[PDB]
């Protein structure tokens, strides 16, 4: 049952919406919520970010695939560290 606890905890956390991975402190996520990157996220990514439940890896890969942000979306955008994004 000890293994059951660990496996259930992992699976349950997989579905979690812990936090938005992006760091609002630094650009390009710095802009006001009504302009810039947030407009694109709100009108092309809402159906996908909620599906992925804001996990950092899916979020980064979706941002990369959209392309309208370009390489800068990770060449200059600073995300939260591993645990600092893991915690809800």
């Amino acid at each position: 049952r000890a293994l059951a606890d660990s496996l259930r905890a992992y699976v349950e956390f997989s579905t979690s919406k812990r936090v938005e991975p992006w760091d609002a402190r630094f650009k390009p996520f710095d802009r006001i919520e009504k302009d810039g990157v947030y407009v694109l996220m709100r009108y092309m990514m809402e159906e996908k970010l909620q599906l992925c439940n804001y996990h950092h890896r899916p979020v980064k890969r979706l941002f990369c695939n959209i392309g309208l942000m370009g390489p800068q979306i990770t060449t200059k955008a600073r995300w939260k560290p591993y645990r600092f994004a893991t915690n809800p």
Partner: protein, 81 residues
């Protein structure tokens, strides 16, 4: 006599395959199962790695028919045979 690489042993690979085929019966060979075949009996043999598709994990992938969980924290307290 060829030397060095296996790709230089053109005839000997053929001879080994012919000999092993002629000596091995399929009745003896039906017994060896594969690692995934053995895993299939586990209540939940397949997990998503945290490298690629950890987010794909859905609550349906769990073996929820054979254990009971507490109502306060949610972790499993016991397991059934």
């Amino acid at each position: 006599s060829p030397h060095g690489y296996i790709r230089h042993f053109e005839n000997e690979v053929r001879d080994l395959l012919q000999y092993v085929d002629g000596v091995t019966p399929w009745k003896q060979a039906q017994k060896i199962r594969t690692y995934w075949e053995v895993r299939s009996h586990h209540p939940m043999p397949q997990f998503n790695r945290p490298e690629v598709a950890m987010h794909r994990n859905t609550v349906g992938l769990l073996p929820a028919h054979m254990w009971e969980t507490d109502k306060k924290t949610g972790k499993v307290k016991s397991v059934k045979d």
